[PDB]
Write a protein that binds this ligand. Structure first.
Ligand SMILES: [Mg+2]
Ligand SMILES: [Mg+2]
Ligand SMILES: [Mg+2]
Ligand SMILES: [Mg+2]
Ligand SMILES: [Mg+2]
Ligand SMILES: [Mg+2]
Ligand SMILES: [Mg+2]
Ligand SMILES: [Mg+2]
Ligand SMILES: [Mg+2]
Ligand SMILES: [Mg+2]
Ligand SMILES: [Mg+2]
Ligand SMILES: [Mg+2]
Ligand SMILES: [Mg+2]
Ligand SMILES: [Mg+2]
Ligand SMILES: [Mg+2]
Ligand SMILES: [Mg+2]
Ligand SMILES: [Mg+2]
Ligand SMILES: [Mg+2]
Ligand SMILES: [Mg+2]
Ligand SMILES: [Mg+2]
Ligand SMILES: [Mg+2]
Ligand SMILES: [Mg+2]
Ligand SMILES: [Mg+2]
Ligand SMILES: [Mg+2]
Lengths: 121, 278, 121, 155, 140, 152
RNA sequence: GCGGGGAAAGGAAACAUCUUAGUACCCGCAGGAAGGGAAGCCAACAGGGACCCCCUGAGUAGGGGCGACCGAAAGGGGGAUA
RNA sequence: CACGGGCCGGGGAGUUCACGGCCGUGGCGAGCCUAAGGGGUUCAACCCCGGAGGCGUAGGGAAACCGACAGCCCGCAGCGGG
RNA sequence: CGUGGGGUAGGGGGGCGCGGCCGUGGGGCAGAAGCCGGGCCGUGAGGUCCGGUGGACCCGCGGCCGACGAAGAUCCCGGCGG
């Protein structure tokens, strides 16, 4: 087939480069794994609904989503979530659940080693 | 709110050119600084050349016309293959007095064209409406950068500031001489001069079909509404496009599929832009 | 009445196949500034008996009387713009009307004054 | 603005009880009698009149009353009347040969069934679809191709 | 002419040797047939192709083993990097130690004179001044 | 969006265009017939791969009957969790009337004709539905609301 | 455009029912368009409201060596409105 | 000792549509897209409207009819501890 | 880093050329395209320059689109040989 080329979006390309550099600098394999998951082909990119966070996260958890966060279902926990992109409904639900929405570089700057950060796909 | 729009990659990635300021400088008819206005949200969109190229290609491909050949071309002769045994190749040949002459095959002189263009062919590349509006917002954001406009090839050394915005009184100018004075005082006359001197006779067969002159693009003028006198005042300049703000499109926002066009916005058009393409 | 189509094939077809009453319009030539101040018009169709100044070509600067006009070729023979053939006979150079300026007007024709008044109006 | 009649889309058994509204052909005679006009007066005023309809909708009645009040108070101009303004009848040549008499109509099936269901209509419709390569006629065997592909991809 | 570091001098000498020994890449019977005499290399995918199979005594096929050294690839034989110049404004941004000027083939004599005078006053090695330009400058 | 070169560009110069030299590009005999044919003679192996052994049901044969669609109902059910999300959105938008001290939902107005029992109910709401499942009615009762069965 | 008469080649990997196709073609008859058009209708107990044409319903119902393959209508959105 | 070309010039062959499967990217995302068509325009471009309808959100059964998860274990990555 | 370096059918990756379009930068009567011979560059498709001929158009770069590449079909048309 036409082999995987990588994203055509320069924002995504720069974010992947940022994550690889951060992983190399801080010796944090989490950023390398997140970059590998974000680099995936568009037909198999990670998308997570907010309802899955209800199961896979408890209160006070820091979660990184290597892809888009979509607003589906109901959220009843308070969680800090970082993602490549967030839909308006997902951001609204995360906010009224008491949680926070961050960019992945913002999460990296706040926690350089990513200690306690949970990958959610 | 626009944190995902402005992705800060510090410290491992050094930042690029600064985003457009929170306010926009406004200039009068005399080219002087007059006031400020709040920057519309459209100028905070990141510049995305791939999306701009896709939207521009869609807008340009919607313009092409269907082309074809005569449906019976090369096929209406009275011909037939005479089989083997005559010492000659078994392609179809003329039946009558011109008998041995080859006929109807794509390798024969006068024969049919094997795979000609068909008028039913789909030339238009459709684009989603939200995608097209996102590309338009990206191109508008690209106009506010000096680097993108220079990379496209405009002369912006003399322009006071980008995004370039003029007062709403400029829409009353109804004469080409007055509009040229306004361009001269605002620093766009060098780019109009570049277009006027860079018009050329293009190479090839376009001259016979009505494409003799290939003219560059100089300045896109944005007014608030249709039928303002400034449109008729400026529309005769070489390479200058003038549209009302609601008629903005990729064909004027990114000629050649490349972002960053030297744009003169009126202040009223900048106010009107806040509820469009969003 | 000469095509308004922007296609060069239609433009050239109209120019080549224009009948004589249309080809008369192609004999228009600029008047001199003195003739313009005298008559109130800027262009007039070149007529036999007019005096014109040749503005281009080998015979540039030569002023003479128009001896012949050919509507079919859209050409004019100007006195002085001549040469000799191999047998010695003198022949006129065919000059396009757009390359001359009218410096004298032959106004003995009543219709010409009507055209002049129409253009001055 | 001349009001447009609002009617109920017919509630089919397939729908299961979901009902919606649509633009009707014209105002009903009961609705017009509610405001004091007959079909002739309404058509003279330019309203669309549907003498066949039996329903009477209060929203239609209110819109009619409002617009008629503007019309009578002169704040609105009624359109031209909803009646035939032209009468163009062509001379008929060869009706028997083109099958337009009663016997021809009976043989073409217009006495018994609808024009859309007559056989000549079916022939012309399928011919036009095949010539233009329209909706289903762009591919021959489309249903069988779909059936086999669904079997293969849903096994 | 252009001074190079020692590895670049050795690579340039090696590239000269490889250019001397490089075979000309022709199809089978190109010498025999006039209809294919001027054609470029064609890697013909046929049943009995012997050039592709590299039989001894036959012509040789195009391979990446014949590639010349990358550090001096594409350089002018003098060692300079050639830059195509179509007007005297093209000379801006060029380094005369590293770059040589090749005037465009369709540049007229009037512009060629200005290009040659500007390049020589700037110190550039002009590869192709032209016979007419050479005669005019000799006459000057 | 990405763009790719056509295969014919690669195939120029190759004689057979990817069809091979032994089994060249021929007419419908190379496909084993025109259209969807051969499935009981030489594509029966395909039928045994994808369909039922013995009968080869989905390729060949009849099974059962169809109830007429013009007399059957086309159902548009909605589960209780999705209904809870919808009523949350409606209450935020002001589309809900708390008529009896509780939220009131009309499935027919919303475009649904049946209530199912998937998900969770969290608020007392009254639902007007022509059909409701047992678990749906029980979960609505647990929430404190009530289901009212309307007649079509 | 309207009415009538009316194939085969090919496909079905043979072939006859079938399809191709009411097509090619033939006979007759009109207009600038033709034909259609004003409920012995459709629906289902709630209601639409002459007709034609476009998008859809939909390759769904259904027809068929139930194979190849063929194939609606009601309903909805428009053009127009008498 | 298999067939084709006397030579040279020019011409000479995987196209398009519909439907389906898949892949590479892009937009939006429990939702996505409008079709016909309508308004405007610097007039086949372009801007706006148009959600009819299609697909997804629930399956099982010939049909009548009924209608759905966070409990436990293993464990890659990752994170934490030695 | 590799006890890496053959390869038909076929699968995958990149590049050259031809006609046009969207941009951008230029050359041309002090001589464009085309043609003849030659030097240089590139593994190569090919590029570029020199001299002669010629007499008005043409080209570099980025993007896009095709009626896009011949040595052969007892190939077609034309010209011309032993
Ligand atoms: Mg032809
Ligand atoms: Mg295309
Ligand atoms: Mg050419
Ligand atoms: Mg069909
Ligand atoms: Mg062999
Ligand atoms: Mg030359
Ligand atoms: Mg095969
Ligand atoms: Mg075999
Ligand atoms: Mg073969
Ligand atoms: Mg069998
Ligand atoms: Mg049975
Ligand atoms: Mg056939
Ligand atoms: Mg058969
Ligand atoms: Mg047979
Ligand atoms: Mg009519
Ligand atoms: Mg009639
Ligand atoms: Mg039929
Ligand atoms: Mg043989
Ligand atoms: Mg032979
Ligand atoms: Mg190998
Ligand atoms: Mg190019
Ligand atoms: Mg070959
Ligand atoms: Mg011959
Ligand atoms: Mg002879």
């Amino acid at each position: 087939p036409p082999n995987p080329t990588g994203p055509t979006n320069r924002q995504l390309r720069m974010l992947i480069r940022f994550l690889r550099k951060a992983a190399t600098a801080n010796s944090a394999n989490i950023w390398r794994a997140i970059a590998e998951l974000v680099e995936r082909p568009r037909r198999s990119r990670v998308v997570v609904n907010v309802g899955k966070l209800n199961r896979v996260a408890n209160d006070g958890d820091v979660v990184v989503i290597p892809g888009k966060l979509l607003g589906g279902g109901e959220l009843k926990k308070r969680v800090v979530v970082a993602a490549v992109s967030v839909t308006p409904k997902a951001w609204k639900k995360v906010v009224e659940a008491g949680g926070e929405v961050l960019t992945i570089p913002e999460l990296v700057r706040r926690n350089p080693k990513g200690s306690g950060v949970k990958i959610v796909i | 709110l626009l944190k995902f729009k402005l992705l800060d990659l510090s410290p491992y990635i050094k930042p690029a050119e600064e985003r457009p300021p929170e306010a926009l400088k406004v200039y009068d008819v005399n080219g002087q600084y007059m006031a400020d206005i709040e920057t519309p949200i459209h100028f905070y969109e990141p510049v995305r050349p791939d999306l701009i190229r896709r939207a521009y290609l869609s807008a340009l491909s919607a313009r092409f016309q269907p082309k074809g050949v005569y449906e019976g071309a090369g096929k209406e002769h009275s011909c037939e293959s005479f089989g083997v045994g005559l010492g000659i190749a078994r392609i179809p040949r003329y039946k009558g007095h011109l008998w041995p002459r080859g006929c109807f095959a794509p390798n024969t002189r006068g024969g049919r064209r094997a795979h000609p263009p068909r008028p039913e062919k789909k030339l238009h590349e459709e684009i989603n409406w939200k995608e097209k509006n996102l590309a338009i917002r990206s191109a508008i954001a690209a106009t506010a950068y000096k680097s993108w406009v220079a990379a496209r090839g405009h002369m912006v050394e003399k322009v006071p500031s980008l995004p370039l915005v003029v007062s709403g009184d400029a829409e009353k100018i109804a004469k080409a001489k007055e509009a040229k004075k306004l361009f001269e005082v605002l620093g766009l006359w060098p780019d109009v001069e570049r277009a006027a001197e860079g018009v050329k006779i293009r190479a090839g067969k376009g001259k016979m079909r009505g494409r003799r002159y290939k003219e560059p693009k100089s300045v896109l003028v944005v007014v608030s509404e249709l039928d303002v006198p400034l449109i008729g005042a400026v529309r005769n300049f070489p390479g200058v496009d003038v549209v009302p703000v609601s008629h903005l499109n990729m064909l004027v926002l990114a000629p050649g599929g490349v972002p960053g066009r030297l744009t003169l916005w009126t202040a009223t058009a900048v106010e009107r832009l806040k509820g469009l393409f969003l | 009445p000469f095509t308004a189509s922007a296609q060069p094939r239609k433009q050239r077809l109209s120019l080549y196949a224009a009948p004589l009453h249309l080809r008369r319009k192609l004999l228009n030539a600029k008047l001199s500034p003195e003739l313009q101040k005298k008559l109130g018009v800027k262009r007039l169709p070149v007529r036999r008996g007019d005096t014109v100044l040749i503005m281009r070509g080998d015979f540039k600067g030569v002023t003479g009387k128009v001896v012949k006009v050919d509507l079919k070729r859209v050409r004019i023979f100007v006195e002085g713009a001549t040469r000799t053939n191999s047998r010695g006979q003198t022949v006129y150079y065919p000059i396009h009307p757009s390359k001359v300026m009218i410096v004298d007007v032959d106004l003995s024709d009543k219709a010409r004054q009507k055209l002049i008044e129409r253009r001055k109006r | 603005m001349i009001p447009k009649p609002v009617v109920q889309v017919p509630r089919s058994i397939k729908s299961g009880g979901v009902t919606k509204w649509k633009e009707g052909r014209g105002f009903s005679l009961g609705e017009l009698k509610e405001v004091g006009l007959n079909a002739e007066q309404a058509r003279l005023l330019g309203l669309p009149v549907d003498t066949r309809r039996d329903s009477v909708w209060p929203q239609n009645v209110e819109a009619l009353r409002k617009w008629l009040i503007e019309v009578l108070e002169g704040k609105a101009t009624p359109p031209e009347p909803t009646l035939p303004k032209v009468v163009k009848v062509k001379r008929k040549r060869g009706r028997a040969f083109r099958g337009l008499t009663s016997a021809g109509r009976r043989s073409r099936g217009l006495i018994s069934t609808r024009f859309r269901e007559t056989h000549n209509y079916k022939f012309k419709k399928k011919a036009k679809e095949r010539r233009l390569k329209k909706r289903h006629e762009a591919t021959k065997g489309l249903g069988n191709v779909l059936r086999i592909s669904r079997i293969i991809n849903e096994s | 002419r252009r001074e190079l570091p020692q590895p670049l001098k050795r690579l340039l000498r090696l590239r000269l040797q490889m250019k001397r020994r490089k075979p000309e890449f022709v199809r089978i019977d190109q010498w025999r047939y006039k209809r294919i005499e001027d054609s470029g290399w064609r890697n013909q995918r046929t049943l009995d192709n012997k050039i592709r199979r590299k039989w001894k005594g036959w012509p040789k096929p195009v391979e990446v083993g014949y590639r010349k050294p990358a550090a001096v690839r594409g350089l002018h034989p003098s060692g300079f990097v050639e830059v195509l110049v179509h007007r005297p404004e093209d000379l801006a941004g060029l380094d005369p130690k590293v770059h040589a000027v090749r005037i465009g083939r369709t540049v007229g004599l009037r512009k060629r004179l200005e290009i040659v005078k500007k390049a020589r006053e700037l110190g550039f090695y002009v590869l192709n001044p032209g016979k007419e330009v050479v005669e005019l400058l000799k006459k000057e | 969006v990405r763009r790719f070169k056509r295969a014919t560009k690669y195939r120029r110069g190759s004689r057979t265009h990817g069809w091979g030299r032994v089994g060249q590009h021929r007419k419908s005999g190379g496909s084993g017939g025109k259209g969807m044919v051969g499935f009981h003679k030489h594509k029966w192996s395909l039928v045994m791969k994808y369909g039922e052994s013995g009968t080869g049901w989905p390729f060949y044969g009849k099974h059962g009957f169809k109830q007429p669609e013009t007399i059957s109902v086309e159902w548009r059910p909605i589960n209780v969790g999705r209904l809870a999300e919808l009523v949350k959105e409606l209450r935020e938008r002001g589309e809900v009337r708390e008529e009896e001290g509780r939220l009131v939902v009309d499935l027919l107005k919303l475009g649904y004709n049946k209530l199912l029992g998937g998900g969770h109910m969290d608020v007392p709401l009254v639902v007007y539905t022509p059909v409701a499942s047992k678990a749906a009615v029980e979960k609505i009762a647990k929430a404190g609301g009530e289901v009212r069965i309307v007649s079509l």
